[PDB]
Amino acid sequence: TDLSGKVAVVTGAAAGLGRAEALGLARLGATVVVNDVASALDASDVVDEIGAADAGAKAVAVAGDISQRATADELLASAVGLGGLDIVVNNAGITRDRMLFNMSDEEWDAVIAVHLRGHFLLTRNAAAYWRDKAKDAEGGSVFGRLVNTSSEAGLVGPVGQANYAAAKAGITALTLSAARALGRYGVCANVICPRARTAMTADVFGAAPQIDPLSPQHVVSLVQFLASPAAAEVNGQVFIVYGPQVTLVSPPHMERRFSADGTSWDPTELTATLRDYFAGRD
Amino acid sequence: TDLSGKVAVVTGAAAGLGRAEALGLARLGATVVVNDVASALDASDVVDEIGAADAGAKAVAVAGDISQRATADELLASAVGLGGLDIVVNNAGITRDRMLFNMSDEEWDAVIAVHLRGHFLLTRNAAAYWRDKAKDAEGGSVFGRLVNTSSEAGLVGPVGQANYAAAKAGITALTLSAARALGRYGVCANVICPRARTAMTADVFGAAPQIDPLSPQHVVSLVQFLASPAAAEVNGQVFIVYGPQVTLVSPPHMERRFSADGTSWDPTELTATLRDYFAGRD
Ligand SMILES: NC(=O)c1ccc[n+]([C@@H]2O[C@H](COP(=O)([O-])OP(=O)(O)OC[C@H]3O[C@@H](n4cnc5c(N)ncnc54)[C@H](O)[C@@H]3O)[C@@H](O)[C@H]2O)c1
Ligand SMILES: NC(=O)c1ccc[n+]([C@@H]2O[C@H](COP(=O)([O-])OP(=O)(O)OC[C@H]3O[C@@H](n4cnc5c(N)ncnc54)[C@H](O)[C@@H]3O)[C@@H](O)[C@H]2O)c1
């Protein structure tokens, strides 16, 4: 799964999971464009840490708020300047947790902006770059890998995280569309829903106690695959990954269909049917 | 399922499904606050049409872009001025379809704003109103019904609709959080994924040919239930509804787990396992 000669963009890569992902791609030979907000990069040695330095191992930092069009444009330009854009790992995020009934517009908008708009801007920019490259190839295949970061919160809607859950669910649907649009060009686009012990999850998961059962490395192993030639037949998939396991999420299932016997439901009859079903139901 | 004495807010109710939903609640006795953008209301007789007029049947139009905080505030104030807010049907939406690689930032932001931010602003405002009412009741139960509108596109990510799919998936996750926060106060919050023949779906579904198999009325019957006392035991549920059937969507299922036998996946081994699984897989 060697990534020599490839260029990867990883967002939110100053610390935590994004930093671990940037290091894992660098270790496979990728040239990594490391993105984060500038204050995160003030306090990070990640670029020095990416002197790991078997392989071309080149790394460059590009500071910017991923929710801004200009950041996505600069990342693309940096990657083109390094020889072409091959791999995108959308990982940047923030939380503004609040009970829904106390959540301000700003708490909502900020989380939507960094997760959902940020994923969009770079996914769209990459989408346009990869399609144009395929047309420039006179219909030839392009190598492209898109790895977007959702969360089990987007499947579940946890209390106090309506904004985080909404962004992560949107990210999943965004990536499925991208997979349908781009798979025909040779691009693979997939979604991960990780759990990893980082400084930002330490309050929920605890601190690290072989290998940490919630090591970021458990996630990196999957991201390395999804970024590689070897994932050519994996597109539009959603994975849950933490510890020594990866789980493929299936398409939506149906619990129960409630059909009228004729051309329309009688409304009081529909009411009776649903009310009875949910009276005896957990 | 009589809604006499209740007040309902329906957004996007000048035409199409929202208009049919406003009429169906009015027919059950609800006082309806009809919301849409003002240009939609220029061309609509919906308020006159809500002279149906058994029951209090009162209806008032409140024009506003639902993506703006002030519209959500005015709708709440109107409902309080009519005696209290009981029912919210978030239905307003737009499409800006485009292949992802051609999608502008504005095409993305507008669809996110009207669907996702609009759902949020009114869901949050209602959430704060219903909780405060319960506290004012010294812990007493409040009647509250929230009906949000997602889409099968949010489960599926169709080509050319990454922005629509992302908004609808976010709406679902938003509503699940709301259901967890608010169910304890007596509020029910549920999601519908409709198909209905409207002027805006006529290009995809065709025109209307008993009853139209894609009549908006098939959806209205479910919305009437979900807005009613009779749905007290239905909270946090996701329904697909079109024609003479309602389908309860189940929580996410897992297709297949890929576990290492020890404390971590060997990355080349994980690659081998996933590559083999997806070689022989549709
Ligand atoms: N829900 C879960 O179970 C779970 C657990 C771990 C990680 N995650 C997801 O994985 C990702 C990383 O999480 P983490 O555990 O590394 O925590 P983290 O706080 O380290 O987030 C990673 C990075 O995002 C960066 N970032 C924030 N705003 C940015 C912006 N506007 N532009 C660019 N970069 C920005 C931060 O600076 C940070 O370094 C996130 O998407 C997160 O939601 C989810
Ligand atoms: N994907 C599907 O299968 C499907 C089919 C039908 C309806 N739907 C959903 O149901 C809802 C209504 O769809 P429709 O079929 O009635 O089409 P429609 O175009 O009539 O949409 C309904 C209303 O939304 C209103 N609206 C738009 N922007 C607004 C804003 N900024 N503020 C307030 N109101 C605004 C429009 O003016 C319109 O009257 C939407 O949510 C739509 O996505 C989905």
Residue B140 buriedness (CB in 10 A; 0-12 / 13-18 / 19+): exposed
Q: Whose CA is nearest to atom 30 of ligand 2?
A: B65
Helix (H) or strand (E) holding B189: strand B187-194
- Written as one string, the DSSP assignment of B139-168 is S----EEEEEE--THHHH--TT-HHHHHHH
Structure tokens at A110: 């900020």
Structure tokens at B259: 């576990």
Q: Which of A129, A133, A150, A151 is catalytic?
A: A151
Helix axes B216-226, A267-279, angle to 10 degrees: 50
Tell me phi and psi for residue B236, to 5 degrees.
70, 20
Q: From the CA of A42, which ligand is nearest?
A: 1
- Which of A132, A254, A264, A276 is best to mutate for the B interface (most B CBs within 10 A)? A264
Tell me phi and psi for residue A281, to 5 degrees.
-165, 135
A282 touches chain B (CB under 8 A): no
Pocket of ligand 1 (CB under 6 A): A 11-12, 14-18, 35-37, 40, 65-67, 91-94, 114, 149, 151-153, 194-196, 198, 200-201
Count of beta carbons in the 10 Å neighbourhood of residue A217: 16
Closest Cα to residue B193, out of A254, A269, A156?
A: A254
Closest Cα to residue B273, out of A239, A216, A180, A185?
A: A239
What's the rounded Cα separation, in Å, for the pair A64 and A125?
A: 16
- Which of B146, B175, B223, B270 is best to mutate for the A interface (most A CBs within 10 A)? B270
What's the rounded Cα separation, in Å, for the pair A199 and A271?
A: 49
What's the rounded Cα separation, in Å, for the pair B89 and B122?
A: 9
Residues facing residue A238 across a β-bridge: A191
Q: What is the resolution of this structure in A?
A: 2.2
Q: Would you say A117 and B109 are in contact if contact means Cβ atoms under 8 Å apart?
A: yes
What's the rounded Cα separation, in Å, for the pair A237 and B190?
A: 27
Q: Would you say B66 and B72 are in contact if contact means Cβ atoms under 8 Å apart?
A: yes
What's the rounded Cα separation, in Å, for the pair A95 and B225?
A: 35
Structure tokens at A196: 């990893």
A203: which DSSP letter? H
What's the rounded Cα separation, in Å, for the pair A26 and A4?
A: 9
Tokens 């060697």: give the residue: A2
Residue A215 annotated in active site: no
Strands (DSSP E) found in chain A: 7-10, 31-36, 59-63, 87-90, 144-149, 187-194, 238-241, 245-249, 254-259
HEC-encoded secondary structure of A226-247 = HCCHHHCCCCCCEEEECCCEEE
What's the rounded Cα separation, in Å, for the pair A59 and A31?
A: 6
Count of beta carbons in the 10 Å neighbourhood of residue A212: 17
- Written as one string, the DSSP assignment of A18-74 is HHHHHHHHHHTT-EEEEEE-HHHHHT--HHHH-----SS--EEEEE--TTSHHHHHH
Q: Give the amino acid at A186.
A: G
Q: Give the amino acid at B256.
A: R
Instruction: Estimate to the nearest angstrom the gap between the alpha carbon of A95 and the chain centroid.
Output: 15
Residues 129-148 of B with CB under 8 A from A: 130-132
Tell me phi and psi for residue B131, to 5 degrees.
-65, -50
Q: How far, in Å, are B136, B218, B232 from residue B183 at the CA level?
A: 17, 26, 9
A224 closest CB neighbour out of B172, B267, B281:
B267
Counting DSSP H helices and E strands in chain A, the numbers are 11, 9
Q: Give the amino acid at B99.
A: M
